């Protein structure tokens, strides 16, 4: 079946700036995104986001900004370049209740008119 939108956030100029790294808040990555009860020591976590355009993407979960700030490194560059993503757009993430912890990445580009693509 289809997935369900977890949280929709806007991409800041920093997300697609020099760093070119994705960032995710804790207020949303705490109630929606759980924690691994097996691999906990020093390393981080991995993610697998699908693409509506018949494509696959894998991001790397890390601990940035003080600590509680979860950033998504690796994959962002290849993604932002593929879809030519930039600042001003909206980044949303969903989750499927299938058998595995599969996720999906969906973006949005508000133009204004309804006829606009």
Curated annotation (Swiss-Prot):
Expressed in all tissues examined: Roots, rosette leaves, cauline leaves, inflorescence stems, flowers and siliques. Highest expression in roots and rosette leaves. Very low expression in flowers. It comes from the Eukaryota. It is found in: Nucleus. Induction: Down-regulated by brassinosteroid and zeatin. Residues 7-111 bind DNA. Monomer. Binds specifically to bipartite recognition sequences composed of two unrelated motifs, 5'-CAACA-3' and 5'-CACCTG-3'. May function as negative regulator of plant growth and development. Contains two distinct DNA-binding domains. One is located in the N-terminal region and binds to the 5'-CAACA-3' motif. The second is located in the C-terminal region and binds to the 5'-CACCTG-3' motif. Belongs to the AP2/ERF transcription factor family. RAV subfamily. This is AP2/ERF and B3 domain-containing transcription factor RAV1.
